[PDB]
Amino acid sequence: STPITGKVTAVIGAIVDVHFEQSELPAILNALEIKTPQGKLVLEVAQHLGENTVRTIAMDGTEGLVRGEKVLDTGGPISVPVGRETLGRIINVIGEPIDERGPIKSKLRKPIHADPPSFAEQSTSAEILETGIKVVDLLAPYARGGKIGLFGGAGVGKTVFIQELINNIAKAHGGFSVFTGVGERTREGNDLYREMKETGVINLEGESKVALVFGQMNEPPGARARVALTGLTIAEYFRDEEGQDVLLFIDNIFRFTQAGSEVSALLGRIPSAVGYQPTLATDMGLLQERITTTKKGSVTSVQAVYVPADDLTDPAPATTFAHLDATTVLSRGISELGIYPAVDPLDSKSRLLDAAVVGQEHYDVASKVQETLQTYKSLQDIIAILGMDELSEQDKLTVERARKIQRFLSQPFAVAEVFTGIPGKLVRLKDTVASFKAVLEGKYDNIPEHAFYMVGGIEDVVAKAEKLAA
Amino acid sequence: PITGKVTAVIGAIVDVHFEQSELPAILNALEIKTPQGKLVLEVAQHLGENTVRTIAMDGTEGLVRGEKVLDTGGPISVPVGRETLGRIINVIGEPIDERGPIKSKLRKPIHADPPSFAEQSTSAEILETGIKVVDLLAPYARGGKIGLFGGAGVGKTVFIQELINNIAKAHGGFSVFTGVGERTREGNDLYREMKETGVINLEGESKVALVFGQMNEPPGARARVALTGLTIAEYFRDEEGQDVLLFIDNIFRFTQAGSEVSALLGRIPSAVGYQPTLATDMGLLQERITTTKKGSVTSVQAVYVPADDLTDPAPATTFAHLDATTVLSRGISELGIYPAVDPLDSKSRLLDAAVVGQEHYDVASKVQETLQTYKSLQDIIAILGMDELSEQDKLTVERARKIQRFLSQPFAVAEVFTGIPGKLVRLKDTVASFKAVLEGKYDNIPEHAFYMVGGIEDVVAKAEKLAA
Amino acid sequence: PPPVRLFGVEGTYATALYQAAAKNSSIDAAFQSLQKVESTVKKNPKLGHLLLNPALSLKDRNSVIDAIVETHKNLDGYVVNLLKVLSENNRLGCFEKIASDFGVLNDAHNGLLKGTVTSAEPLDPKSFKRIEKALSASKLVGQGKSLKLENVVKPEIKGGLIVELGDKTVDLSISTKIQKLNKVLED
Amino acid sequence: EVSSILEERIKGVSDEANLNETGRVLAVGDGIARVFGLNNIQAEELVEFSSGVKGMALNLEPGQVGIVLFGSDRLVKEGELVKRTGNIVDVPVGPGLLGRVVDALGNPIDGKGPIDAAGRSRAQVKAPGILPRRSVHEPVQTGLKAVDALVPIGRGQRELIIGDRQTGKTAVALDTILNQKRWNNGSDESKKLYCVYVAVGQKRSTVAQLVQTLEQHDAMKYSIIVAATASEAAPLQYLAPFTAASIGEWFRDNGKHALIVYDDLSKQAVAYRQLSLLLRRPPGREAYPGDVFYLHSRLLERAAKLSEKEGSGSLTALPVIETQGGDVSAYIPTNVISITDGQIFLEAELFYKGIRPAINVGLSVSRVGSAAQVKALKQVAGSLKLFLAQYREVAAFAQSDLDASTKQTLVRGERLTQLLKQNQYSPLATEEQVPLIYAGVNGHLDGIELSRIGEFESSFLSYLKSNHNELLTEIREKGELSKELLASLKSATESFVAT
Amino acid sequence: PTNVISITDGQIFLEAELFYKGIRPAINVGLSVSRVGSAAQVKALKQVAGSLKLFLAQYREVAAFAQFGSDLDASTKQTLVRGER
Amino acid sequence: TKAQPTEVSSILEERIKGVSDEANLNETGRVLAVGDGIARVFGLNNIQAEELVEFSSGVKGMALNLEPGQVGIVLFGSDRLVK
Amino acid sequence: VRYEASLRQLEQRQLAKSVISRVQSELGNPKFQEKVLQQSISEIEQLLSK
């Protein structure tokens, strides 16, 4: 800690201006520690206002800040510790255990800031992640090293969707995962922590295949903003140095936008459209750019996004929409229809779905599905006024297949045993292609609608028909 | 010589610090010496403390703070003359026709104040065109503002050309085509077309003078192009007596240009962004466009409706100045009817019985009534069947469809474009033509005879030829 | 008139003072008295504290001026009128700012340049003379304006020197070179 | 050692600059260093910091010049000497940027060694004059049958591509480039279009995929990719289309032709917004700066088909604007729509309905049309325009008891629409565009069942190659269909249709 | 409201029109959600109210079709009748 | 610190020169910065509120804002003839 | 293979701190006097070459 001592000059919020003395210059993005009964209050230097008077953003609370309070300068971006005991413990923004499993093993420390790898470095994705969720697999197949994006409602099983992913994909792949919570509830935290202790992904004796960095919304906006950057560096340690692929998970990135929006305003920087940061685009962009499939390690982000008032053309979701490789929308309506998952199939679209890429059969089947659903959707309006009473036998059959497909999508989840109490199903990729193919061919047009409802694979569709048949 | 050193270049808003008591006035024109020749900055504020805030006409492309400035001493003085006819002139009053230094005798300041109440002529006059449709259903006005609607592709440009031709026949007056926010493609086309249609004939005589204001030109210069054009027009009106017809392109881009200048000057943007001085600027422009004792300017303006909203402040403000609106329809041009004018959407405020004649008013009213009834009649005549027509109803339908054909008359300009040499019909003969057809005297004349010919006399001949 | 504008920050005050006292040709005298009263003011700790502080009222500010003219008598009544102006405008915190600026205007009018030979350590008299020579030899000092250079020691420049004057610098700081070296060997 | 060589490079830097103007940062916050000094600075000067960061000087204020850093704040700090490079922004322009991916600065981000270029020229330079511009007599073919006929495109022509977000927005652009491989192979340099793709916004991973696709189709050997990625700074993003245009000027000036695709200018706008708000420059409609219009207009008028005295050359342009909800009313779209000469408007419903390209013909327009259209292709697609117009109207009368006339329209219309569908990344030759459309126009294939259209199409092409690749080559070389060619073509179609 | 919606573990939207419709106290059950919460009610009450949501959701869909005035099949009118009661 | 209407160098030069009275600032003012059809005048201490003032710019204006040491007249007339 | 490559990178960073150690050595040495003097006279020569 350099003998640059500053005395606070203005407590006006999280923004705290410090007055370092003459002949001693700070540097942007430093870390100030202020001795307090709050340990060290950490201030990230974010502007220089000259005359050795900085304007810095607080991480921790500014209550009881004494005017002219000595501020040590620890310099540079805050450096957390990283190791492999990062795995299996919850870690706050300033890099300290929240599960109180003692300090994370500090083999290395790294700064929370890091810079995106160069264009040259990038190695492009071209592999297919499997989710075991049939709708997801057919109509928006995910790709390893991807940038999956879970746009969705108010924790409308947003968490549940992720829980299923962790249950299937995370456990399955040997690589690490990092579960990062930006401004999320301690109720949710306790459930997730407990749940992932239960699923054993978190092993509190022995290594965990997940790490946690839970930043919660009671924390001041500054801490909420810069929790993400910390998480990225942990992934980088895994990605680069451990070499291991990271199935990253972050929650919720609208909260990342909101946190940033607040400190834009507080920094005095005029906020752009719908009150977002003036630097909204570039801040999102830097975050997104850091996350990529690198030769050292392929990073597969799954990023929760909360669509404020279910409007995704609001600039913050819409801007993020570009950066995401494999967008997914989880809608209330489909949930309400009783279809789990709540995914809106038309709107959920992954970049890879190209004909050769997913294979001609998969593509052709999916094209037929898309048409079947789109036809059904067109016919819903017709049914609305005209009724289904003068629209073709063929149209009726297409509609019948669509109702069946609609409830074929209804597939339970193991992590909605908590909810529904119905154990989930994992259906092989080949099997899903086959099962959709059969339906379209009309092979299963003698199978009851409810014998597609809340079932898995082809065997199950037939089996629940047999159950009803009996 | 007044001099000052540039002491800021925040954007194209350049603060110049002048030696004391040698502080320009607002609306003066400054020329800042540059390897670009000069950059003309116009003093739009006195910021006091021997500094100003100025706007640019010629963009700032590297400027070392402190460059010497020379003050012309007042609003830019643009060349004027009867020698400035057929010269393409950029905003700073300099040739872009590349026919070298503009042939001119005098130059005159671009800012000028509208003629007095006394110098406004107390009585309105009616201008005439060969276009019958215009002279009947939206009578052309001598002095007036007639705001054009309907984009190029209906032959908007050809309509504009037609007007130049008509002005030459009608008076032998002049015109100035001012293009604000003009695409460089469109500018090329227009110059070539004007040369081709001989309204500009470089070797020959060139009546219309061109002022082209491209979108690449600074917003300040977009605002000032119109005022330059007006000065040229006023030289014609005031110092040659001659009536003028002044085309303006998008008045959205006039507004937009003004909006930018407000924002740059820091002035609070009024509703829908537009400058708080929007109305007054239009007012100056359209009160300098008026009928003086000497002559009268007349202005055709082009209104690129913003978002097709007529509820936006700028279109409403424009409509206040407008006396007539000419509403070209592409449906009408698609009926092969050139003129492409939408007859029932073309309206003028001069159409009153006293103004245009009681007979003419009644004839016009009848043509409007005929057409109005025809459209409505065709609605249910088409649906119910054409054999549901009464004798009266088919008289109206027949009359209308014959009139619709009678409206189509080739234009001299559209000699090339239709392939048929022009037809112009004078105002007295316009009234006469509709009277006879209305009185069904010439309702023994068929639809195709009426098609693509001028006045009543012409279609007596054409009826015989059509049959032959 | 100002021989070179110093853009505001009560340097508009310095300018005004300068042109007024330049036309009364009492700029050296003004500067000397201003420096002299400022020196003893600085060496008074209540006007090396509360003069800075905006504690003083209207009435208390007026009474501070009265005490100041006890501290010295005469020498440019335009700088005594300046005291009134500054007290009334309540800017006494930027008083020395004006003084420095007035000095710059004064010695610029006289034709004297200031400069510095910021270095990591004190430099030879040989170095001083050589630099004085060098600058006069170079067109940078063309003469008609004097040359003054103040060598200052800043250990921040870890070695080498940077000469600065007229916005003309020659910078041989080793610290910067070390930085670039470090950067390429962290590539 | 790797260390010794790296030091050897550093060792060769020891030149001292007696900096005529030096400045020192007073305060740097928000990437807006406010520097004291720099009195001799020319506007938009390139300035080099102590950090080595480069900047431009948008605000020249009297006491301080508020430089905008092209770099990042992480390596910038207060008090820093700010050397004045003293040269307003310039970028290398020249021949050897073909098949090269460069960032805005002109540094290769593909890192395929130093750029080969003939000069570094300023990028704030203006657009060709009215007299220096003459009509577009040249068509250009994208290899997409509908685009080339319905919305025929020319050279030195600017036409918008306004459409739904990344729904093969990039795909439409790439398709042109692939057909330009054919034309590039073609010797005439009006047919050697040296394409420039300006990836604005688009992240390095996304552009890496583009790069890979381009390398796969060997398109790099005339392509230039000016790349301003998401990580790349907003000043770089702001000046990126201006910079790109300058590269284009070298080709245009050389009398050659080229095509510059600005994708997407919407993200350029956001960068200008970011800059303006941070420079306290006045915000404007939709919180975009007021003179954002002034920028776009300058850029888009540089593109143009020059006069024949100006060496008959051009810079074709096809700007891409991404409409987030199809909001053409949005301030940046409205402005661009006026400036551009044409629009292509892709519709989401069509995308969903598997029509990919999802182009909606109604809201697609070309305002130069047949001036830049192949004569052969004009002949056999006037009918097509009219037919499709009827099909659109009678598509909504597809909903019970319907006249035979209506049904004929539906049969012809559905089949035509299906015929104009094209699988992504399949370009075509004009000599094969003309036959297929001719058949559809003559309703030969409108007779053929909808399901059988696709198989017929490919078969027809092979059949045409077998029967008369003389006809195809003749169509290609003559470019104008003689009555005899239309006869012969009809015969071939009839013969094929019968099988 | 946006900020609060995120914080809270449920939203209990109430609808004024439905107050007037006669559900007073009113509720807007389409927007009444519990983001987290899903069990914390009586065990007995969990068993019974299982398809109450489904019935109502179906009632909502059916009612929309019904409001046009179009003729309704008996299956829809089972839903409509069940929902109304 | 902050802008003041006594920052204007000519006003300031007189004050330093020990000149600050003599009806210059009572029954007359001298115009400062001007444009936007409003003028900021120094003096006019004997001005009435909503007075008519006649400028030596051939224009008359109605005093609107009586501010400490400055008055912001509103110019009933064009700024062309005002400096 | 991965840690083998990593050790090479780690070595470059190790050698970076060894350069830093050598920086302190230079600044300890009367290279601090003599090479600063060398810079002084070099700057004089450079400034004379202006």
From Swiss-Prot, chain B:
Annotated TM spans: none
CDD domains: ATP-synt_F1_beta_C, ATP-synt_F1_beta_N, F1-ATPase_beta_CD
Sequence positions bearing Phosphoserine: 333
GO biological process, one term: proton motive force-driven ATP synthesis
NCBIfam families: atpD
Further remark: Present with 164000 molecules/cell in log phase SD medium.
HAMAP family: ATP_synth_beta_bact
Role description: Mitochondrial membrane ATP synthase (F(1)F(0) ATP synthase or Complex V) produces ATP from ADP in the presence of a proton gradient across the membrane which is generated by electron transport complexes of the respiratory chain. F-type ATPases consist of two structural domains, F(1) - containing the extramembraneous catalytic core, and F(0) - containing the membrane proton channel, linked together by a central stalk and a peripheral stalk. During catalysis, ATP synthesis in the catalytic domain of F(1) is coupled via a rotary mechanism of the central stalk subunits to proton translocation.
Annotated protein name in UniProt: ATP synthase subunit beta, mitochondrial
Organism: Saccharomyces cerevisiae (strain ATCC 204508 / S288c) (Baker's yeast)
Lineage: Eukaryota, Fungi, Dikarya, Ascomycota, Saccharomycotina
UniProtKB/Swiss-Prot annotation, chain C:
HAMAP family (UniProt xref): ATP_synth_delta_bact
Subcellular location, principal: mitochondrion
GO molecular function, one term: proton-transporting ATP synthase activity, rotational mechanism
Full protein name: ATP synthase subunit 5, mitochondrial
Subunit structure and binding partners: F-type ATPases have 2 components, CF(1) - the catalytic core - and CF(0) - the membrane proton channel. CF(1) has five subunits: alpha(3), beta(3), gamma(1), delta(1), epsilon(1). CF(0) has three main subunits: a, b and c.
Location(s) in or outside the cell: Mitochondrion; Mitochondrion inner membrane
PROSITE patterns xref list: ATPASE_DELTA
Native source species: Saccharomyces cerevisiae (strain ATCC 204508 / S288c) (Baker's yeast)
Swiss-Prot record, chain D:
Residues modified to Phosphoserine: 14, 135
GO cellular component: cytosol; mitochondrial inner membrane; mitochondrial intermembrane space; mitochondrial nucleoid; mitochondrion; proton-transporting ATP synthase complex
Protein's cellular compartments: Mitochondrion inner membrane
One Pfam entry name: ATP-synt_ab_N
Additional detail: Present with 41500 molecules/cell in log phase SD medium.
HAMAP family: ATP_synth_alpha_bact (MF_01346)
Subunit structure: F-type ATPases have 2 components, CF(1) - the catalytic core - and CF(0) - the membrane proton channel. CF(1) has five subunits: alpha(3), beta(3), gamma(1), delta(1), epsilon(1). CF(0) has three main subunits: a, b and c.
Protein name, as recorded: ATP synthase subunit alpha, mitochondrial
Organism: Saccharomyces cerevisiae (strain ATCC 204508 / S288c)
Lineage of producing organism: Eukaryota, Fungi, Dikarya, Ascomycota, Saccharomycotina
UniProtKB/Swiss-Prot annotation, chain G:
Record field: transmembrane: none
Segments forming a coiled coil: none
Cellular compartment(s): Mitochondrion; Mitochondrion inner membrane
Note: Present with 12900 molecules/cell in log phase SD medium.
Subunit structure: F-type ATPases have 2 components, CF(1) - the catalytic core - and CF(0) - the membrane proton channel. In yeast, the dimeric form of ATP synthase consists of 17 polypeptides: alpha, beta, gamma, delta, epsilon, 4 (B), 5 (OSCP), 6 (A), 8, 9 (C), d, E (Tim11), f, g, h, i/j and k.
The family this protein is said to belong to: Belongs to the eukaryotic ATPase B chain family.
Protein's job: Mitochondrial membrane ATP synthase (F(1)F(0) ATP synthase or Complex V) produces ATP from ADP in the presence of a proton gradient across the membrane which is generated by electron transport complexes of the respiratory chain. F-type ATPases consist of two structural domains, F(1) - containing the extramembraneous catalytic core, and F(0) - containing the membrane proton channel, linked together by a central stalk and a peripheral stalk. During catalysis, ATP synthesis in the catalytic domain of F(1) is coupled via a rotary mechanism of the central stalk subunits to proton translocation.
Protein's recorded name: ATP synthase subunit 4, mitochondrial
First and last residues shown, out of full length: 193 to 242 of 244
